[PDB]
């Protein structure tokens, strides 16, 4: 389940990350997006028909998972994103789009090369795959425990 | 940094060797794989990871993921049966790096996936053509040849 409560400080917890990174710019937020959405794939393997248990470790799963809600929470802010356009997205929690596990990635690759990525697919994308594949709740457990270890790593650097 | 015929038909001998070791081997998830080691590769480059003072992973990361690539294009291209012909045909198509540079090579890839998808030339051409324009193609096949040794090794 996932509140315009939680969504909105989900985008605060993004929005205090990305304010201290002076190089952000939407482009790089876009193809780092993709990116991730393969680094999460590639954690699910259902492809990996020579493996004999495929997949890698759950955690593993909702960390990648959090990677790309990094980004799409990212893309939504530095898009200017709505109150309006968030409540009017809410309610499509109990849509399709995350597919089948078998046409995912066939499909995100068209909508991309076709459409390109707008904040409210970028958003609802990693929200609905954990909402149809594990937890929304797991999700974001995992989310705001890689963006503390994202800050530590930026005062570092 | 040239390559012959022979290196190439010495590759997919290579190849083949380890995928009848794959009694699950098809091309639909060949197809699949292949695309995730590209991107696998691409994120090695970290092109677009302006928050990173000294972006790119090391070489080695960087050679054993287009080793990867290069598998499945070889993979793809013994499963499609593909021909002495279109080999010879092909190694012309070295040469000309033309498509991508590296600031569009994701984008460009994902294109040609979407509108033409993958067919025997192209998924062979690509990380050859990668290989001869940023690292070199001794580089890509030596790196090939160890990564496979791992994966046959892992099979064991
Ligand atoms: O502008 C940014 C940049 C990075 N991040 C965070 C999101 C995500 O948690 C992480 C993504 O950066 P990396 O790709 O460098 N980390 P990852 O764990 O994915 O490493 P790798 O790509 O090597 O697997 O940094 C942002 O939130 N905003
Ligand atoms: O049918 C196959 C399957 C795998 N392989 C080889 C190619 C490639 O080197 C490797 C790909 O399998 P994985 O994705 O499981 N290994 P990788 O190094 O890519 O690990 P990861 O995806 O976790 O980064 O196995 C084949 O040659 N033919
Ligand atoms: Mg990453
Ligand atoms: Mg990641
Ligand atoms: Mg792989
Ligand atoms: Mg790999």
């Given at each position: 389940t996932l509140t315009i409560d939680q969504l909105q400080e989900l985008l605060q917890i993004q929005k205090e990350f990305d304010?201290?990174?002076?190089?952000?710019?939407l482009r790089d937020s876009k193809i780092a997006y993709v990116v991730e959405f393969f680094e999460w794939f590639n954690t699910l393997?259902?492809?990996?028909?020579?493996?004999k248990k495929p997949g890698k470790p759950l955690d593993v799963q909702l960390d990648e998972l959090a990677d790309m809600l990094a980004f799409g929470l990212s893309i939504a802010n530095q898009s200017g994103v709505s109150l309006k356009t968030l409540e009017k997205l809410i309610?499509?929690?109990?849509?399709?789009?995350?597919?089948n596990t078998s046409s995912i990635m066939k499909d995100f690759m068209e909508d991309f090369v076709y459409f390109g990525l707008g904040e409210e697919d970028s958003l609802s994308l990693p929200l609905n795959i954990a909402y149809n594949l594990y937890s929304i709740d797991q999700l974001i457990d995992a989310y705001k425990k890689k963006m503390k270890r994202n800050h530590e790593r930026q005062d570092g650097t």
């Open positions: 304010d201290r990174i002076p190089t952000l710019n393997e259902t492809f990996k028909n020579w493996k309610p499509s929690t109990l849509g399709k789009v995350y597919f």
